[PDB]
């Protein structure tokens, strides 16, 4: 529960690379929390 | 949050199936719904947004939140009870059977909404999203959520005797899906142009 | 100085049970104390005993009661209206001793358009008499409860009036939709039988009659929904269900 | 690159018994999604995260190849072409309807497969050229036609019996972004529905195909897109009615409903 | 270097209940492992679990089994054979999932002039079959038990003289007057339905028939004592006793 | 990583004349295995030890390929399907029915080959799809089928007269570990025998083939499985009696022995 | 009489790698000695 990959591309362009293997933390309070005045 | 396609009794109309009706009662302890916890095919959690979201999945672990709105006047009151039964049995008969479980008696006010918290009882870690009968896969059974009036739906002379609820449902930060699958209602019988 | 304004809101939540209110009127909590388990100095059975906790220590909502015109009064005994109910009810089958407190949240919601009083007691060691000496049928009538006969008297020879000397709340409409009363255990001794004797008696009384803005008038219901608090349980043995 | 990111977790929780703090109690009409957790509504005891959420990435969702085209070449003209679009099947283009703005770049899977008129496997060795042809470069007319020279336009040379021909594209739009959906219309001075719902700057081209020698039996090609290196903006409700056409979003729409029906709301 | 004098002699003390042995066989913990409750890393259901302690972790008695020269061998299913009978069988029917260890104590005693030999076995997902498929009634039998058709076959296809590779005792009379394990909780998953999979088969089979100084001999039965170790039960709401 | 763990050795004993240690004495009931050892029963010499226990580990075991399906594709439909188990061959499952739980990841080899009508060896050069449908995904009905676009379900395409496809799967159940064996019903309010023994938790699906062109000669497939980075918990008394059915284990036990009977127990 | 092996993995998944070569020490006390009072 942690796939660490290899980047390694054998050619010169970033398209020739494989799929992107990190995780980015979403954020869902732009489509949960769009109010202005925020309240909990 | 996305509505869902709550009210589908037969021979309702878009729209129309978004809103579980809730009426002045005559009766004590009644009930207002009942739906099979499932993000599995054809009920009215599939067509939601975590239900779409479903049917690309093939298995499901985590809480579920469930937020429904009151949409009568704001001189009509009520309390309804709602209720989350862990699988086993069947779906509860009466309120007094539907209260032994997880619930939540929402009190209509100034506070338009009430959330029934469904949290993740379940005795593996993660379940199926199909109840697909030749793998028995209702093995993966989760439950049932009811409505019922805790007190009654009372209104003003003249004013109207049926109002609704609007029944939202998301998925909680506890919530993941795992092995992507094919949607089955979205077909092709011959190449689009 | 000021009564009302952010004491009107209210959520209690036990176990897997959560309940809210919008127009509540502040919550009374009996003698000033809060429910508690027994002392190692004030107790005497010498068994280990049970704690059920989230199991049995939860909202459990009773046969709701429509008020009608000619309404007198309901009551319900603890804990003998719990006794066959529920987790709570099994240990106190199984045991011969218990102790516990309550947490009781009784509701009636109307209109603006009507207008009515109830007073909501909570009535300790509440030994009930009429014209003559009631029969098991009225003294526990379990889940369903009773009905009053002799309201101005409190059935017991006193009076309606001087009950206000009782852990109360009113539901007077024009001001609240329900009261919520937390009760510590009561007894003369450590602990004692569930189906043979009853600590507290919830009652509910109209005091002024329900009105409405109409001769008509909507089916206008009052629920009770009660929780065991801080409960023990010594002498275990089989399930013995009623004192009969 | 590491894709460890968990779910969140459950901390114990106890009694409330609060006049003032009451988190059940929402307003859905402010359009935020409701603030109760497990915790503020049952009494809870504490889970440590052990579950990923990889799967649900974006990247992850786009990451496999999938049919978006499938030109037959016939034995009597030995040529075919492919207007690029991922809008022919539907598997790829629903997914792609959850979102409105998606940068990517592509990578292009092509296997062949010769058949007869029946349209029964045969063995056929041939080698094919793939030439890809951008708006304004001159489309070829027969298999013997000089555009195949090459000049400018890439191709790919390979065997209709050999491994499938493989390659990868980078994110080519004169845009910053793709776009899934568009409400406007292609051209200035001009109204016509036909034009409305066209994005011009999504269309790339032609892949264009042809049998270095005269076709002996029919040939079909296969062509799968991944889209990898994903960047999407914008989530959108999906797509429910089924798809009608290629290039809009016109539904039958005949009994508007989408779940299942029942007798009662009280029963299943 | 020695095996046998003080380790005849046992007292287990749980809840109100004692047992007492004077020619056991020492005591046997099932792969080295004592019951234990459930971790937060292990865990996955978020509800506070109940632990009815004292009132369901104590030791039951079931109904006596004679040994007969024809007797096959005897099973029982667990949680299954105690998913009715006192405070362990309530909490078991209202919740969702159980998770739980076993104290079991099997007796038979004889006189120094019989000879007889059981085989006490303790079987994980003892899932079984003869020529056939099994109903209901044989693959949860409840607290009668169920017997052996096959007990060669182990009524699974296996063998009863590879058995011993499971948690074992053996009562030989000349030897011993009865067999106690200590069983924890096994499952590919954290818990489960108490009343839809059976996790352990307590199972009793005779290798050496029952043999007198006489031809009559009187009434030798066998009796099974068994007690829930370390449980908690999660996802509560009403009893649902079976899996009918 | 490094497997040089040893047997264990001998060092050297002398005569025993004792009135209190007695290790030759034992007593069976307490369900423990026998203390003695070669030294305290005989004069024993000094033995280094020399041998390894690797081809007796638990991934040794179980790490290498066994066939598990066998699936046929007929020459009119051009299509057939494999439910994933390791249930339908003897050999692979007996060796599993050592362990009660087993978690572990595999490796999927398939090897195809075409035949005659008489079953003989035809050349034949299509290429195939795998394509693994989970639990809920539509099925394909036909070669044709929209299906087979696998905008999210996996495939793996390869040649029929090609090396054999090959990939690896994770740990999938939904559980902590496979269950071999399960004492209990597949569903709630059901007690049907069909459903007895039955573990959904294990079963992931499907895998389903197909020619890319309607094919012409037969072509069968073989799927060998490899289990590896195994842990297995609890051990068995191992399948003595055959294997009749896929999904219970009843036999036949017509004769109650295992083992060769002879004359007499005192001579061979 | 102790084979060790290269790790080496070209895959960003773990199910990709072959087989453990790795050697655990068995420890057969579960089931041959699983008596509380241990005696020897
Ligand atoms: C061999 C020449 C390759 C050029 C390929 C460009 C591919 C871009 C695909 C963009 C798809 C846009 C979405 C849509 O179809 O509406
Ligand atoms: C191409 C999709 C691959 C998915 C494969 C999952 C394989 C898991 C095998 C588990 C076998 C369980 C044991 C049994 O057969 O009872």
Same mark, same amino acid.
């Not at chain 4, 990923?52 to 990435?57: A, L, N, R, V, Y």
């Given at each position: 529960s942690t796939i660490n990959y290899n980047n390694i591309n054998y050619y010169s362009h970033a398209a020739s690379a494989a799929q992107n293997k990190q995780d980015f933390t979403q954020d869902p309070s732009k489509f949960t929390q769009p109010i202005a005045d925020v309240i909990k | 949050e996305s509505i869902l396609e709550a009210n589908n009794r037969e021979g309702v109309e878009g729209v129309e199936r978004y809103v579980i009706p809730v009426s002045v009662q005559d009766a004590l302890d009644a009930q207002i719904y009942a739906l099979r916890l499932e993000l599995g095919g054809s009920g009215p959690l599939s067509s939601s947004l975590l239900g779409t979201l479903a049917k690309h999945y093939t298995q499901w672990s985590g809480s579920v939140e469930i937020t429904c709105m009151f949409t009568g006047t704001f001189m009509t009151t009520g309390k309804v009870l709602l209720a989350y039964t862990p699988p086993g049995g069947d779906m509860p008969r009466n309120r007094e059977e539907a209260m032994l479980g997880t619930h939540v008696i929402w009190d209509f006010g100034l506070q338009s909404s009430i959330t029934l918290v469904i949290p993740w009882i379940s005795a593996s870690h993660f379940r199926g999203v199909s109840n697909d009968d030749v793998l028995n896969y209702q093995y993966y059974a989760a439950g049932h959520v009811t409505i019922w009036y805790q007190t009654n739906m009372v209104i003003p002379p003249?004013?109207?005797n049926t109002a609704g609820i609007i029944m939202m449902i998301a998925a909680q930060p506890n919530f993941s899906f795992r092995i992507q699958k094919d949607r089955?209602?979205? !077909?092709? !019988?011959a190449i689009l142009q | 100085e000021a009564c009302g304004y952010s004491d009107r809101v209210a959520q209690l939540t036990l176990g897997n049970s959560t309940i809210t209110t919008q127009e509540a009127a502040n919550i009374c909590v009996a003698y000033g104390c809060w429910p508690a388990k027994l002392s190692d100095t004030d107790a005497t059975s010498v068994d280990k005993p049970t704690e059920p906790g989230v199991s049995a220590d939860r909202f459990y909502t009773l046969r709701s009661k429509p008020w009608q015109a000619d309404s007198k009064g309901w009551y319900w005994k603890l804990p003998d209206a719990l006794n066959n109910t529920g987790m709570f009810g099994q240990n106190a089958q199984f045991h011969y001793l218990y102790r516990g407190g309550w947490a009781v949240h009784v509701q009636c919601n109307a209109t603006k358009f009507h207008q009515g009083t109830l007073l909501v007691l909570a009535i300790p060691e509440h030994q009930i008499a009429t014209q003559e000496q009631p029969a098991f049928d009225r003294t526990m009538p379990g889940s369903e409860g009773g009905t009053f006969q002799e309201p101005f008297w409190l059935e017991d020879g006193t009076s309606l009036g001087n009950s206000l000397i009782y852990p109360h709340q009113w539901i007077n409409l024009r001001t609240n939709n329900s009261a919520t009363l937390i009760l510590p255990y009561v007894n003369a001794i450590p602990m004692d039988s569930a189906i043979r004797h009853s600590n507290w008696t919830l009652a509910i009384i109209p005091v002024a009659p329900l009105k409405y803005a109409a001769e008509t008038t909507p089916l206008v219901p009052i629920t009770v929904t009660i929780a065991p608090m801080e409960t023990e349980y010594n002498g275990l043995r089989r399930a013995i269900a009623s004192n009969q | 690159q590491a894709a460890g990111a968990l779910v969140a977790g459950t901390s114990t929780s106890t009694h409330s018994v609060a006049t003032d703090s009451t988190p059940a109690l929402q307003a859905a009409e402010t359009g935020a999604t409701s603030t109760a957790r497990d915790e503020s509504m049952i009494e809870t005891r504490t889970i440590v995260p052990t579950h990923?959420?990889?799967?649900?990435?974006v990247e992850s969702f786009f990451g496999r190849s999938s049919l978006v085209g499938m030109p037959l070449l016939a034995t009597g003209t030995s040529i075919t072409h492919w207007r690029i679009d991922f809008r022919e099947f539907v598997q790829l283009r629903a997914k792609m309807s959850w979102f409105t703005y998606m940068r990517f770049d592509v990578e292009f899977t092509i296997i062949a497969t010769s058949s007869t008129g029946q349209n029964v496997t045969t063995e056929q060795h041939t080698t094919y050229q793939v030439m890809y042809v951008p708006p304004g470069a001159p489309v070829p007319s027969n298999q013997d036609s000089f555009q195949w020279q090459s000049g400018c336009n890439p191709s790919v040379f390979a065997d209709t019996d050999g491994p499938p021909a493989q390659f990868s594209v980078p994110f080519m739009s004169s845009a910053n972004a793709y776009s899934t959906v568009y409400d406007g219309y292609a051209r200035f001075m001009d109204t016509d529905p036909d034009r409305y719902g066209i994005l011009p700057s999504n269309f790339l081209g032609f892949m264009y195909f042809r049998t270095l020698e005269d076709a002996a039996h029919q040939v079909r090609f296969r062509i799968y897109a991944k889209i990898k290196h994903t960047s999407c903006w914008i989530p959108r409700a999906p797509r429910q009615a089924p798809y009608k056409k290629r290039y809009n979003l016109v539904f039958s729409g005949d009994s508007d409903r989408i779940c299942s029906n029942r007798a009662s709301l009280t029963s299943y």
């Open positions: - | 003249g004013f109207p089955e209602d979205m !077909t092709q !019988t | - | 990923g959420i990889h799967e649900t990435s």
